[PDB]
Amino acid sequence: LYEDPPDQKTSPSGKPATLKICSWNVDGLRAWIKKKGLDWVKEEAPDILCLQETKCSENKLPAELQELPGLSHQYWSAPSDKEGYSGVGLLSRQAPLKVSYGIGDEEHDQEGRVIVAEFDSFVLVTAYVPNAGRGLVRLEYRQRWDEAFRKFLKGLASRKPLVLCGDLNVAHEEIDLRNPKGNKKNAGFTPQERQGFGELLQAVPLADSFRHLYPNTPYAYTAWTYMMNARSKNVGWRLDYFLLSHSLLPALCDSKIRSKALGSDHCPITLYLAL
DNA sequence: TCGACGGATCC
DNA sequence: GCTGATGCGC
DNA sequence: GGATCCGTCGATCGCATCAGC
Ligand SMILES: [Ca+2]
Ligand code: NA
Ligand code: NA
């Protein structure tokens, strides 16, 4: 079992956290709201909330989402021609300077996976990375995605400090899942997916916020299959990340795993920055 | 993720 | 709206 | 030749679609 440590809300130089970002693969936004997700969000009170795998077109967005005046600026992306699949959202207390959808590549911008929100001091990207598939049927596609995404993020980070959050659909290293041996040909732990993640960290470059602070902490996961009672056994994967520009590391206060928040087969993760 | 399967392969 | 089947996925 | 091993290999859970009416 795993117990996330208490929230560190001061920076390495003693500056108080001024910004709290929460990211959560809700795996069915309507179901997550029915499973009381927005109660949990309201007690966490983030300044920005990023959601993945909403599986909900904009028309079907439940009413409860306009009853949250702390996250009143809301942006949504859905697949162009495939309903109930993928989907992401970004809700913010303050309006961003600019919002865009996708990474600027037609091939990869059709499944509602990416929202980019530019603020004063940084750019925030939230992403739902495409799963490599059962039988690895989409691994070849995933490797092309990885190359296009890496390139996109490198470009962005060259202009403003970057924060990338969301479900990146890879457990980087053997410490990031419960059963590394049995999963090296399964989606999320292929050498191709792990190599892509490493290349992302090096080429942009980006740092893995949680591992920067807790480099040797095992059993810390963000996702558990619904089957086989995995979550109660903590047989999980760390698939949800906050990746940061190296320049933001002195602003980094903490990177949390909200293990006990139910409502999905992923738990939320939370980032504190002193900006 | 778990167990049932099968087909090496040591004692 | 309801049933039954298919898609997709830690 | 009875008992362990180790590469596959199906059925689980959950959400949302779709076809039909
Ligand atoms: Ca499928
Ligand atoms: Na390894
Ligand atoms: Na630096």
Residue numbers in the entry: 44 to 318
The authors write:
The BER pathway is comprised of several factors; the scaffolding protein XRCC1, a damage-specific DNA glycosylase to remove the damaged base, apurinic/apyrimidinic endonuclease (APE1) to cleave the DNA backbone 5′ of the resulting apurinic/apyrimidinic (AP) site, DNA polymerase (pol) β to synthesize the DNA, and DNA ligase III to seal the repaired DNA. Two predominant APE1 DNA cleavage reactions are (1) AP-endonuclease (AP-endo) and (2) exonuclease (exo). APE1 exo activity removes 3′ end groups, including oxidatively damaged DNA bases, chain terminating nucleotide analog drugs, terminal blocking groups, and mismatched bases. Our structures demonstrate APE1 uses the same active site to exonucleically remove 3′ mismatches and DNA damage by a non-base flipping mechanism.
The F266A APE1 mutation had the most dramatic effect on exo activity, with a ~20-fold increase in the observed burst rate and a ~50-fold increase in the steady-state rate at 21 ± 7 s−1 and 2.1 ± 0.7 s−1, respectively. Notably, this burst rate is close to what we observed for the APE1 AP-endo reaction (<2-fold difference) and the steady-state rate exceeds that observed for the AP-endo reaction by ~threefold. To further elucidate the catalytic role of F266 in the exo reaction, we obtained a 2.0 Å substrate complex structure of F266A APE1 bound to DNA containing a C/T mismatch at the 3′ end of a nick and a PS linkage modification 5′ to the C. The structure revealed that mutating F266 to an alanine expands the size of the APE1 active site, allowing the mismatched C to occupy an alternate conformation. A restrictive active site and larger exo substrate may be responsible for the reduced incision rate for the APE1 exo reaction.
